[PDB]
């Protein structure tokens, strides 16, 4: 029933006292957290108090949209040597530190994304030459479908590839998708390996990577310029904004205090310092 | 007139869509459809139909009859395996091939028992007993009679009823499994062995040969579809 | 397609130390399983060394094993061979193949590789 909107708890008036209750004393070892109110130990006055908790609830401290990557397709002309350059780009959340922090916070969480597309585009030679509105498309190959080859080749029929179509100079492009975990929760850790290595089998065959799950794994994206060659190259460039919704979360852990290095859990050397100098004694 | 506002999204072509739109044919008199016997609803149904499974694609036998028949023997009693085949049905070109392995390269994954049965196709003189058995993955494959013991099996008897039946119960960590070659989310290992040997009286052909069958049992179910890998144009 | 851009061989004599630097183009990221090759002049093609593209793990072979170093270049997506102690029979047209991947497998010979490199010969001179 106590919803995110509504009132904290009002601070009653309480006076002087000398008794044998004790609220100031704990004991942290017993690993509680000593409940304390304002006025426990000092004299308060009656508050009605108006602030609420609204705009930090689990499901507000993810609203906002976030980067999560920078894909890089092209469409040079026909006449160049260099191949129509189409990208391709595994979907992680881990490949920019932004959204990862503030994942982090949890264990676990089930959250059905949204995602949305700006497509910014540019010349590069510098001719007066032109070029006619783009039209991009956005393919989702989910895990273990053939993953596109040229940038003309079948594999983007899409006859079950569910694509989308953005013509260039529109309102950016956006899709829903629902919770896609083969588990019951996303896993933002494993611990653990997909492979057990066995007495008799070689040690090549036995061996993993250390918290590299299937759990985290969601296909791949590709991007290709629809139109054909044209004879002055244009570069774009497709950000890929996610924003967790319907969001809920699984045992908090610390967040991530030195620079992350990599998609495991791992730090580099030289960056494992957070705090600054500060005195003791100087406030 | 009513203000709106075009918010993100407007204009993007979603071939995954679900949106009306224009009629170009109006008031076209759409014929009556028949009653057509045989009236499918759901892909599953046809996963749910036995479909012979090619266990050897050796060199010389694949794509080619040869591919479908096991061959047992008459020979004397060993504890080496019959046959092999790892529980991926879409990523092990055994199942890959099959009806039940054609829907899942359909799907991104799959979840459910699956079910093997075994038809004999000797004389109607030789008989015996042949092991049947499902590891749950994550240890040695089996290899010796005596391991696949152990596991998930059914000891098979040759007989009046032509047929045997074995289920895989749906043993796994994860809530499905992904269609393709995954460690983490591995299915398994198949295995059948001699229990007793194939005997068979004086006059009768010393060896005779199986047929394999594969399917879904009333509780599969797949899952976020994709295209397949089973199909390629070129140019 | 991947296009694998070898580089560079040549004839050096016993001891020896050269290099190959192999591109991705391609699209070096988590697929590619770069390795290493060498064709013992129609023996003769063996694997070498190759590295994991999603880690930087290493395996060589046990001929090349502490001689040869795989490196790599992850952002320029380049991966080397630091081809140390050239001696005679390190005289093979060299190769660069690269395959997809295992989510969290590493990268073996018996895994990879479905694309080919160029085949930049290196000898090494008696």
């Known amino acids: 029933a106590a919803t995110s909107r509504d009132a904290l708890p009002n601070t009653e008036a309480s006076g002087p006292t000398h008794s044998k209750e004790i609220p100031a004393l704990t004991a942290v070892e017993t690993g509680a957290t000593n409940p304390l109110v304002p006025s426990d130990t000092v004299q308060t006055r009656h508050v009605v108090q108006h602030r609420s908790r609204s705009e930090s609830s689990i499901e507000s401290f993810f609203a906002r949209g976030a980067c999560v990557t920078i894909m890089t397709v092209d469409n040079p002309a026909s006449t160049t040597n260099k191949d129509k350059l189409f990208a391709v780009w595994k979907i992680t959340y881990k490949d920019t530190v932004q959204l990862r922090r503030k994942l982090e916070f949890f264990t676990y969480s089930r959250f059905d994304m949204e995602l949305t597309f700006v497509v910014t585009a540019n010349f590069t030679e510098t001719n007066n030459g032109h070029a006619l509105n783009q039209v991009y498309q956005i393919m989702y190959v989910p895990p273990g479908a053939p993953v596109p080859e040229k940038w003309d080749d079948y594999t983007w029929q899409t006859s079950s590839n569910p694509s989308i179509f953005y013509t260039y100079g529109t309102a950016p492009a956006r899709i829903s998708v629902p919770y896609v975990g083969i588990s019951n929760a996303y896993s933002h850790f494993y611990d653990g390996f997909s492979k057990v290595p066995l007495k008799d089998q070689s040690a090549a065959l036995g061996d993993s990577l250390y918290g590299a799950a299937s759990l985290n794994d969601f296909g791949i994206l590709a991007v290709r310029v629809v139109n054909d060659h044209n004879p002055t190259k244009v570069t774009s460039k497709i950000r890929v904004y996610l924003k967790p919704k319907h969001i809920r979360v699984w045992c908090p852990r610390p967040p991530r205090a030195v620079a992350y290095y990599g998609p495991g859990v791992d730090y580099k050397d030289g960056t494992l310092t957070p705090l600054s100098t500060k005195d003791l004694t100087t406030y | 007139g009513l203000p709106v506002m075009n918010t993100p999204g407007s204009n993007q072509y979603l071939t995954a869509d679900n949106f009306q739109s224009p009629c170009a044919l109006p008031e076209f008199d759409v014929t009556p459809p028949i009653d057509i016997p045989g009236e499918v609803k759901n892909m599953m149904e046809l996963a749910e139909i036995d479909t012979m499974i090619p266990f050897d694609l050796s060199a010389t036998k694949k794509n080619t009859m040869e591919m479908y028949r096991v061959r047992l023997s008459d020979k004397p009693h060993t504890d080496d395996p019959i046959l092999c085949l790892s529980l991926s049905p879409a990523s092990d070109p055994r199942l890959s091939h099959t009806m039940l392995g054609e829907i899942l390269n359909y799907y991104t994954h799959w979840a459910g028992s699956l079910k093997f049965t075994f038809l004999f196709c000797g004389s109607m003189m030789a008989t015996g007993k042949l092991l049947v058995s499902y590891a749950p993955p994550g240890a040695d494959p089996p290899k010796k009679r005596k391991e696949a013991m152990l596991g998930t099996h059914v000891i098979w008897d040759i007989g009046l009823q032509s047929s045997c039946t074995m289920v895989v119960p749906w043993i796994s960590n994860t809530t499905y499994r992904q269609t393709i070659d995954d460690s983490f989310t591995e299915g398994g290992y198949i295995s059948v062995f001699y229990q007793t040997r194939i005997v068979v009286p004086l006059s009768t052909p010393r060896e005779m040969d199986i047929l394999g069958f594969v399917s879904a049992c009333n509780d599969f179910s797949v899952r976020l579809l994709r295209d397949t890998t089973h199909i390629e144009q070129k140019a | 397609q991947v296009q694998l851009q070898e580089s560079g061989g040549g004839s050096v004599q016993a001891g020896g130390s050269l290099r190959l630097s192999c591109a991705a183009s391609?699209?070096?990221?988590?697929?590619?399983?770069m390795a290493w090759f060498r064709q013992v002049l129609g023996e003769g093609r063996e694997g070498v060394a190759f590295?994991?593209?999603?880690?930087?793990?290493?395996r060589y072979a046990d001929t090349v094993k502490g001689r040869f170093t795989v490196s790599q270049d992850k952002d320029k997506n380049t991966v080397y061979l630091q081809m140390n102690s050239l001696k005679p029979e390190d005289t093979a047209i060299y190769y660069c193949?690269?395959?997809?991947?295992?989510?969290?497998?590493?990268?073996?010979?018996?895994?990879?590789?479905?694309?080919w490199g160029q085949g930049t010969q290196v000898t090494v001179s008696s």
């Open positions: 193949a690269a395959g997809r991947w295992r989510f969290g497998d590493i990268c073996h010979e018996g895994s990879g590789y479905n694309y």
């Open positions: 590295i994991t593209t999603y880690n930087g793990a290493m």
């Open positions: 391609g699209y070096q990221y988590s697929l590619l399983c």
